[PDB]
Amino acid sequence: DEDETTALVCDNGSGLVKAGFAGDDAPRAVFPSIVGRPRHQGVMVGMGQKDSYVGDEAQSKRGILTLKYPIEHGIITNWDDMEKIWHHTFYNELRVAPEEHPTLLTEAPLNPKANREKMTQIMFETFNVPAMYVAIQAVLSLYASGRTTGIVLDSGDGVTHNVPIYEGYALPHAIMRLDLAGRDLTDYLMKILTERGYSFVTTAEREIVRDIKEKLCYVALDFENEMATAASSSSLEKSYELPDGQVITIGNERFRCPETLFQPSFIGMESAGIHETTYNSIMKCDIDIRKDLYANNVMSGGTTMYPGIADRMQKEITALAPSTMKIKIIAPPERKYSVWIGGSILASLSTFQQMWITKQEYDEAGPSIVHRKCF
Amino acid sequence: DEDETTALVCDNGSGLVKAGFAGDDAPRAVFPSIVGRPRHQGVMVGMGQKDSYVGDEAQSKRGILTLKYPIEHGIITNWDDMEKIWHHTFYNELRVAPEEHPTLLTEAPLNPKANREKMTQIMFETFNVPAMYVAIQAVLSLYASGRTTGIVLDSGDGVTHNVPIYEGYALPHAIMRLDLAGRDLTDYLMKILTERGYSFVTTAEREIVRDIKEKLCYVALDFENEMATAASSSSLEKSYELPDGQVITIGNERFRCPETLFQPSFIGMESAGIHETTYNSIMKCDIDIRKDLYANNVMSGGTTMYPGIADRMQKEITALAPSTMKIKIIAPPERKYSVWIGGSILASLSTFQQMWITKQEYDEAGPSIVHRKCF
Amino acid sequence: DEDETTALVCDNGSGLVKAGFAGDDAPRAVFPSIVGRPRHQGVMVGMGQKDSYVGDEAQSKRGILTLKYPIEHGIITNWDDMEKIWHHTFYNELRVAPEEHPTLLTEAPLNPKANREKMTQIMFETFNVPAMYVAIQAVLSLYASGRTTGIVLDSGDGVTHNVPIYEGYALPHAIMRLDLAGRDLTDYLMKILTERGYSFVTTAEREIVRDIKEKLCYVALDFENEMATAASSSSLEKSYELPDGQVITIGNERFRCPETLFQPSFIGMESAGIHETTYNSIMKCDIDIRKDLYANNVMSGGTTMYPGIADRMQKEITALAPSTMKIKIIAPPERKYSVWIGGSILASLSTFQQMWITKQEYDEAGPSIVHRKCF
Amino acid sequence: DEDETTALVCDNGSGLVKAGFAGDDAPRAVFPSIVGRPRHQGVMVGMGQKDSYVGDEAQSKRGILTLKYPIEHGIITNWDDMEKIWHHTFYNELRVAPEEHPTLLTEAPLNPKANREKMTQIMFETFNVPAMYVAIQAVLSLYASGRTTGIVLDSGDGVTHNVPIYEGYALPHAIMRLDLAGRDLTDYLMKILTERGYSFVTTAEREIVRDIKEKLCYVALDFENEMATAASSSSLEKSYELPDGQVITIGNERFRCPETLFQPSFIGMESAGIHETTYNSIMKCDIDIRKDLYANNVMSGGTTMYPGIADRMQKEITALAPSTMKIKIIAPPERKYSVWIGGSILASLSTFQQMWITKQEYDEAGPSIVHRKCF
Amino acid sequence: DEDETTALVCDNGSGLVKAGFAGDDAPRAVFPSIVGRPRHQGVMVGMGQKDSYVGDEAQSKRGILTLKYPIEHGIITNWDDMEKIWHHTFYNELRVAPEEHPTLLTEAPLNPKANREKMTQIMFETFNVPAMYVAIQAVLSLYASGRTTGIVLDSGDGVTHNVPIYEGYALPHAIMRLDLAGRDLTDYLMKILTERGYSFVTTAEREIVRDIKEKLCYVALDFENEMATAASSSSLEKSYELPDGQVITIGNERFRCPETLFQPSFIGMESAGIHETTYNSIMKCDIDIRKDLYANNVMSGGTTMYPGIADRMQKEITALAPSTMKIKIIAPPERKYSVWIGGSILASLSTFQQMWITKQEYDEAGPSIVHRKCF
Ligand SMILES: Nc1ncnc2c1ncn2[C@@H]1O[C@H](COP(=O)(O)OP(=O)(O)O)[C@@H](O)[C@H]1O
Ligand SMILES: Nc1ncnc2c1ncn2[C@@H]1O[C@H](COP(=O)(O)OP(=O)(O)O)[C@@H](O)[C@H]1O
Ligand SMILES: Nc1ncnc2c1ncn2[C@@H]1O[C@H](COP(=O)(O)OP(=O)(O)O)[C@@H](O)[C@H]1O
Ligand SMILES: Nc1ncnc2c1ncn2[C@@H]1O[C@H](COP(=O)(O)OP(=O)(O)O)[C@@H](O)[C@H]1O
Numbered sequence A, B, C, D, E: 001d002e003d004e005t006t007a008l009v010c011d012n013g014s015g016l017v018k019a020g021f022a023g024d025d026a027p028r029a030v031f032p033s034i035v036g037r038p039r040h041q042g043v044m045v046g047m048g049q050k051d052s053y054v055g056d057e058a059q060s061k062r063g064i065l066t067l068k069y070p071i072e073h074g075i076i077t078n079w080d081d082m083e084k085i086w087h088h089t090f091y092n093e094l095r096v097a098p099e100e101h102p103t104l105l106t107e108a109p110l111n112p113k114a115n116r117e118k119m120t121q122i123m124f125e126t127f128n129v130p131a132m133y134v135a136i137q138a139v140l141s142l143y144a145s146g147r148t149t150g151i152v153l154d155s156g157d158g159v160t161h162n163v164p165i166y167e168g169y170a171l172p173h174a175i176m177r178l179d180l181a182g183r184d185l186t187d188y189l190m191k192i193l194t195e196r197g198y199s200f201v202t203t204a205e206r207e208i209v210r211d212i213k214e215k216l217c218y219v220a221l222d223f224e225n226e227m228a229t230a231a232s233s234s235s236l237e238k239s240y241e242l243p244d245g246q247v248i249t250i251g252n253e254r255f256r257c258p259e260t261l262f263q264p265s266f267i268g269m270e271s272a273g274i275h276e277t278t279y280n281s282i283m284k285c286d287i288d289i290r291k292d293l294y295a296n297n298v299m300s301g302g303t304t305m306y307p308g309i310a311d312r313m314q315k316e317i318t319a320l321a322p323s324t325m326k327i328k329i330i331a332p333p334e335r336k337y338s339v340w341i342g343g344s345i346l347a348s349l350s351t352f353q354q355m356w357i358t359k360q361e362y363d364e365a366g367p368s369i370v371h372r373k374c375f
């Protein structure tokens, strides 16, 4: 609180907002992106509740609330709800006066121009920021990495991409999309557990299943052989206590759930699994740069956090590639916050501080400015 | 760095610049003559790239870049690009201060007067050389050889010539031209490999094919009989690993590609093959000097480097010449740098140091001087 | 069904089989070339479905099926699938007994010898044809045209060529290739529509987008000026009802999609647009025949069907050619079936009936016969 | 078509056949003497072309064809090709039945006896002429002129001669030969235009250059002074449109090309220029007849058609001859057909009709007859 | 190198210089008399050539050089060139210091007084000889012979004479001249070989033809009968390999060429053949000395070297002379050097050493002295 200034790095996630100050090593505020007020709301004797805050309160308030994601699949679809999320971010989580900070916002891949313009309009008109930037989330991640060359497999919450990069450039024609990512894997685990006679269907039960997924699932060494071991499997049958206190047993569901990344037909997806899309992406590049891609396969995103994933990707890529090809899979430790960190590096870039968009630019060429000939 | 001085010998090739110091046995700097910057250029997060350097970086940077040759067919056609190549030569490759060195430049056969004048203007005005010479590349080669008499077959990258020489003089009416040389053979190998179901069409793929040509092609003992052996040929089917790691098999393409020098109709050229042009050149000379030409057929240029070429030329010339004629084919070992070496000998000629062109001559009779009544 | 005989004209297209009887004015059978069976196949209560028929059933059966093209890029790559397509052609579409009809088959440019031999082997051994011919598809088209001289621009589904022709001969060195054609334009329209927030990614969605392309796209008068008019464009914003019944609006995507033929960099292609390849092809011919080429530029192929294409080509060629050059663009009305019609003319050529290949020739010199010294 | 008869006057030129009926004022048929069929011949879909007709078709068919002259340097060297030229002459150009017409044929200077005998054998055995004569082409020209005395400079297509004549007799020891004539000047113009960066090397390009030569070249008033005016020459820089439509500029090449007749060293010829050979020829005659030669210098042949040639020859001869010598240069208007006209006069000579050679003479003393003791 | 002294005998021939020391049996130095430097001279890379040496170098250097004879027809016409020939003679061929040797020079018949004076001036002023003599070449030959009486037929290179001699005196009125000799016969053989379709026109080709003449020509026994035998002549058709290696066949040209000495009308000469001039010379002498002439006909000169010439001259003279006349033809073996040998005898004549001309005589009565009242 003086001269200088930082850069409000707000990564608008499909399920979680990550926000903080440029220059910090990780976001200081992480809260669910949802909207929820009592679904039954039966009055009582007073009030003192906040209608649709969701954020952190919701979670801990599981069972009372309803949820909505105004950013459900990564694109913002409800501007009144999004204004509530940004107000919460600035005033309740970070506890800042937004008019004192240049703010860098992230946007999903393929975000419409008109959507970026509405984001810009709200920042300047509603929150009175002195400036702002919009950055592409994949791009920020790439930034955080620091690798000019290599092929990234980025699997997050709602989408997975394979992005080959040569000298810093995402050759746009190589990238392929997959709908599936963690949101789909949590829904599939709810369904397969419901196969055993359990019942996980409510909003609260979804949260419970997301926790089972993140704590007990793993990727097999070989799907077929893991299924065969399931028979005499005395390991798989882990126990998990529900908040009600009942204890369920989870066995082959531990590896059947994430097997979907390699076999999208488990959820009905025709798409090619992540090892096939990696190969298909490398084959859309020049033959010449393929050796550099094969030796620099970088994993990113929350859904690449499973133990065993790098070794499995090494095995599968080795099976598809030429016999003399050197293959290397890199996974950065704390991948998931790779998107926020790239934003932090960019926003905290004094040297490129002219890329931030300003109140004068917005007034001159409206918000589009932050879209036409920059970010 | 003292008195005396050397002579900047810069051989401006259609595909490669050869440059160094007069008196060295070979050029110290050899780099592709091209211009290229990112064809897709997708920004990123910083810079630190050099726009259109090409030189050596390009090659190793295959797939990102585009190429241009400002000297595509041997004549310089873009002076802003050529200034970049000469700046790279002096400051980045040789690491010299050009104002300290007389510089000998080479020029293609049939280079327009106005082109030699523009070369001269740039050397004096842009690089401030103390002097300079322009030399004819064929001539330099001839110089390097050291043979006063004989008929040279010089096949390089973009052109092939037959030059009969009697007492040091190129009888200008005997020389014949051929468009075809190595540039054409690389393009033809790309095309014939594409016949087998492979696809070699990009800039990067051209470089790959140039490597296959230089490592695996050869000239047959007899074209017709080699084609007949192709059937039960278990030798021809060599393997070559692409940078992508795939392995292709090359068979009759190994000798079909260079067969074009003897049969220009393979690429649609009406011209007479190199054995016919040799004979036609000797027959435009006096009958009397023909015995000296037949016994001194000297091969020069990169495209004469194929194993077997001297024996094939001996066989073909013997078949066309009178039965009692003594025929000898000479091939100098490291032919290709024959052009640079001749320049080095000339430029490093203290005794003929008055042939260098000077800043006073350029100022007096402009650059033309280095054209009218000298080189 | 008597003496005489016709000629089974089967044009094996990358996406569509065109087949019929020699002498008919157009093919009587046109069906998608694909292979597809239920991707989910969930049993039920009976059967009565045909595993991978594709043909016409598929289309109308959109959403259930998967697709494969055994001729994806014009070259046949799966012989068991191709045998199914030919069986369907003969027995289900034409309803003929193949052993009663000489059959002319078409093949893609650059089809390997061994591939033509396998086509021949199947016709004689599997279908017992009395004879057969293999014809080159471009050639058949040329045949259908009837023009000895002129430069053809042929843009079809998977490839576009510029072919200069003087007295009936395709000067092979003039022709240039382009990967792009209609298959690429449909993929690019799916991608650009997905930019607006729509989602066209499935096999069924590809078919939907191919229909939007064929019904609503057009080529601009000038790309730059059309983009500028897009702003106040109240015309462009056509509506299109999806099979789900939702209605999308299509605007600048109508002309951005086919702009790719003139600007291949829109899909990442370095290649030169079709006006540049036309000029480059004419410049590889003798100067003398150029006036005949400029006055006989013939358009062929499905991707040349856009309204406005001839006028745009006239404008662009006029801008590149000498000022006194007479330029004429010819487009034959029903171009697309130009390939089948040329086959029909050839196959129905009683006078050249000796070019058909026979069961005795195949038995004597195997199938190669239909390759070595004929078609 | 009745009694009487004319005389088939066929002048077998190195580049053009001139043929017609004795008594006509000029030949009715003039066509290139060449042989050419498709050099690439790529089949197609039919035929209807004539293999190696050349004649007129070739020219108009420039770029497809190859050429051969069976009479390249004036002497017939291929009898199967010559039979094709004579068949074309009789049946396609003149449309006559050769067995109805005595035919006079011309032959080059120094034609071997055996060659005249083979010409005679073909006329009688192949074409069944009733008679024939062979005439010496120079002689026919002399005949056409009508001058008994004077020195002729005859410059045609492949040769130039100086022939002093006193009372009708060519004093054989005075005549001198020069290789150079129009064929050489066209080749030299191709070469010098290629010096400016143009490229004229193909058969079609040779025809183009022959047209530039015949339409735009001229002989200078003084070579040295014309070169000096070239600097500020704003006239010379004429424009010429190529069939491709490009426009080239021609300047000093307009007079440098024909300067070769006066300076044969421009093409490497040691020979003395045409003014020196004229003087050298007059000095090999008696001193006494020199005054008659100096006052009757007659120009003949196509290469004497340049505007300015008579005035230049007057100037140069005046400079070499004694000061009191009366010098006169005569140039007949339509010189080039001077050879055919002399043949027409001779052949149409009823009074000397006994000089024609007959079928009985050929049968008696073979063809030689038309050689031994006549023509 | 001591007292005494020899006499520099330099025979200045029209084509060959013969020089040596008086008293030697034959000249030690024989070299072509010519002047020649590169006709094309195209620079190169150095020098080390001698501009117009000609001498021996020329010959062996055939094709590069030009020729000039400063003594073309026997009379010296260029004194700067002649000084070069004499310098070469003294310093390069004989390797003498001319100031140490009295030098005898030969001169052609009818050499002008002023020419002999200029020869004398050069010897004394340029070469500082101590003395010199000028001798008449015919005279020297006569001297070498040793016959006081008889009629000599002397046929050399540029002239042929018939000289009747009675008691040592050439009766000047009897002698007759002929232009023709070997120079003419070589030119005529070039022309007649060019009749068969060969082409011998250059300086190098002249040298080749001179060799064919000297190795294969001969004089017939009877011209008419030799021509008649030519038909079934299987002998005449000798082969001769050209330096280019081609092989020509020579037949009746072997005797047609030298037939010109007996029939000068073959080259257009009106003159009477050598047998007629012999008879005409004898008839201009007294009747009384004719018997001595008829019995002493001595042949001399290079052109009398043909085998068969003495027998033919015996036959022809017998046919013209009275029936009882004794006729004898003498031919000295090595006739050609008869001119040099006579000079050697004279110059080496101690007894007549007072006839040498001295530096004092030249200074007193200038050079004329060696002309007025001596030689
Ligand atoms: N340790 C982990 N193991 C497996 N999945 C994880 C882990 N940590 C986070 N995830 C999952 O990763 C997803 C969030 O990843 P993220 O890269 O932030 O996605 P996005 O950027 O698409 O919002 C959620 O589905 C979450 O459950
Ligand atoms: N060993 C080799 N075998 C065959 N071709 C070769 C070899 N080395 C070089 N070349 C070829 O020679 C050509 C370069 O020859 P060069 O004489 O330098 O040509 P230029 O002087 O016309 O630029 C290139 O086409 C190159 O591929
Ligand atoms: N009216 C049309 N307008 C634009 N494209 C068309 C039209 N009709 C057909 N096409 C396209 O033309 C292509 C098929 O053309 P065709 O010449 O048959 O190709 P190929 O021979 O390469 O299989 C398909 O991409 C199709 O969508
Ligand atoms: N008007 C002209 N000006 C200059 N050259 C001409 C002209 N007309 C014809 N020629 C040339 O004259 C030559 C033909 O002359 P011609 O006397 O017929 O030769 P030849 O008899 O040796 O065949 C050709 O080289 C042609 O280009």
Ligand SMILES: Nc1ncnc2c1ncn2[C@@H]1O[C@H](COP(=O)(O)OP(=O)(O)O)[C@@H](O)[C@H]1O
Pocket (backbone or CB within 6 Å): E013, E014, E015, E016, E155, E156, E157, E158, E159, E181, E182, E183, E210, E213, E214, E300, E301, E302, E303, E304, E305, E306, E336, E339
């Ligand atoms: N063996 C020979 N047969 C025929 N001619 C010969 C022979 N030897 C020399 N000659 C010719 O004789 C001529 C030279 O004779 P020479 O008496 O020296 O002449 P000159 O004195 O007139 O110079 C040359 O033409 C040469 O070719």
